[PDB]
Amino acid sequence: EHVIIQAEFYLNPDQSGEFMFDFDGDEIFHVDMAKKETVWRLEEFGRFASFEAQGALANIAVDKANLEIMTKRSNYTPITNVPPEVTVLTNSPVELREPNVLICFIDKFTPPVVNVTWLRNGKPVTTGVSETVFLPREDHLFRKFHYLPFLPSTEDVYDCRVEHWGLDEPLLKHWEF
Amino acid sequence: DTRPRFLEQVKHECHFFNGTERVRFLDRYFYHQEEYVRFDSDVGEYRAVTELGRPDAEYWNSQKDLLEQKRAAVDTYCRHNYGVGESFTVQRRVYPEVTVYPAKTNLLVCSVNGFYPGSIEVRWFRNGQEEKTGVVSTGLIQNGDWTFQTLVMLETVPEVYTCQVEHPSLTSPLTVEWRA
Amino acid sequence: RKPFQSVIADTGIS
Ligand SMILES: *[C@@H]1O[C@H](CO)[C@@H](O[C@@H]2O[C@H](CO)[C@@H](O)[C@H](O)[C@H]2NC(C)=O)[C@H](O)[C@H]1NC(C)=O
Ligand SMILES: *[C@@H]1O[C@H](CO)[C@@H](O)[C@H](O)[C@H]1NC(C)=O
């Protein structure tokens, strides 16, 4: 009926960590390890619940300990790069002058390191863009979302540019009205 | 960047059947994408999932206070967090938006947007009766923002077409009509 | 109102 998953990772040599709670594949929150703060997936969750974000660093520190042990135990067997499936779709059916959101869905990839850029007519745009952290999958690969709020026009084309070590070239997913 | 990568994951998984009536806790350890050792509350101790997890399973199973703590987790962790999140997760209802529009390849698209939860039935009807074999869909799309969408398309020669949507947020079916 | 509880990974052996 429902699954709650506290999922964490640590990655060498990047020393990147993540700590997050998932309910049925949606993120409840992650901890920003720098600031030591709980980041709620929706504003409203933070009216109903709290978290000890301070303690997430202890969890990640155990994952690093374990990684160092498993690295030796495996004989320094490195991860095999798995490049992402990338898909671009809108929140809703696009009507002219009706504000909307482009979603870039980056699926089935490891390791959890990825460069994503919104391109409008081939130029990078950042006004209003948001992204999720890396989200776990049942197969232990990662998935991730980037969002661009936009005003639909006949004169603009869009691309989601995705860099990953699994890919030869950057991967561009096209969208236009 | 020459350098090789090494990744440890841990997933603490709480599985609920009939709310908190039946709970299974799973403490799962991963090296890259390979589960090497797990604690399962149905077993009540660690088990190696691969050769690489044998030492950790032996080591952890010898610490009886550690196992005592982990077996209480269905109550102190799983049932605690279900109870924290219930009102805004388990009980979240967001109504579908339904549009119908013609598309090129000729298609009638029934677009169902912004709904929660994920369970939805979308059916196509042509002048009264139900079409299955000329229907193609997106499947369920998770938007990553606690919202799903789906596009259910009828391959057709456009009569009166009706898209029927059934979702937990709706006391009865939503039926949208499109006339050629 | 109510806090979410985390569990910590166990540390393995060398
Ligand atoms: C994401 O972008 C960064 C920086 O834009 C990429 O990194 C760099 O280029 C090489 C990496 O081997 C280094 O010489 C530099 O130190 C990096 N530059 C900066 C500004 O950080 C990074 O590799 C990209 N990630 C992916 C997956 O392609
Ligand atoms: C769920 O919980 C109650 C016990 O509190 C039980 O009587 C009921 O039948 C259960 N529902 C199902 C579908 O088994």
Automatic annotation (TrEMBL), chain B:
<keyword id="KW-1064">Adaptive immunity</keyword>
<feature type="domain" description="Ig-like">
    <location>
        <begin position="96"/>
        <end position="175"/>
    </location>
</feature>
<keyword id="KW-0732">Signal</keyword>
<keyword id="KW-0391">Immunity</keyword>
<keyword id="KW-0472">Membrane</keyword>
<keyword id="KW-0812">Transmembrane</keyword>
<dbReference type="GO" id="GO:0010008">
    <property type="term" value="C:endosome membrane"/>
</dbReference>
<dbReference type="GO" id="GO:0005765">
    <property type="term" value="C:lysosomal membrane"/>
</dbReference>
<dbReference type="GO" id="GO:0002250">
    <property type="term" value="P:adaptive immune response"/>
</dbReference>
<keyword id="KW-0325">Glycoprotein</keyword>
<keyword id="KW-1133">Transmembrane helix</keyword>
<protein>
    <submittedName>
        <fullName>HLA class II histocompatibility antigen DR beta chain</fullName>
    </submittedName>
</protein>
<dbReference type="GO" id="GO:0042613">
    <property type="term" value="C:MHC class II protein complex"/>
</dbReference>
<keyword id="KW-0491">MHC II</keyword>
<keyword id="KW-0967">Endosome</keyword>
<feature type="disulfide bond">
    <location>
        <begin position="110"/>
        <end position="163"/>
    </location>
</feature>
<dbReference type="GO" id="GO:0002504">
    <property type="term" value="P:antigen processing and presentation of peptide or polysaccharide antigen via MHC class II"/>
</dbReference>
<keyword id="KW-1015">Disulfide bond</keyword>
<feature type="disulfide bond">
    <location>
        <begin position="14"/>
        <end position="78"/>
    </location>
</feature>
<feature type="glycosylation site" description="N-linked (GlcNAc...) asparagine">
    <location>
        <position position="18"/>
    </location>
</feature>
<keyword id="KW-0458">Lysosome</keyword>
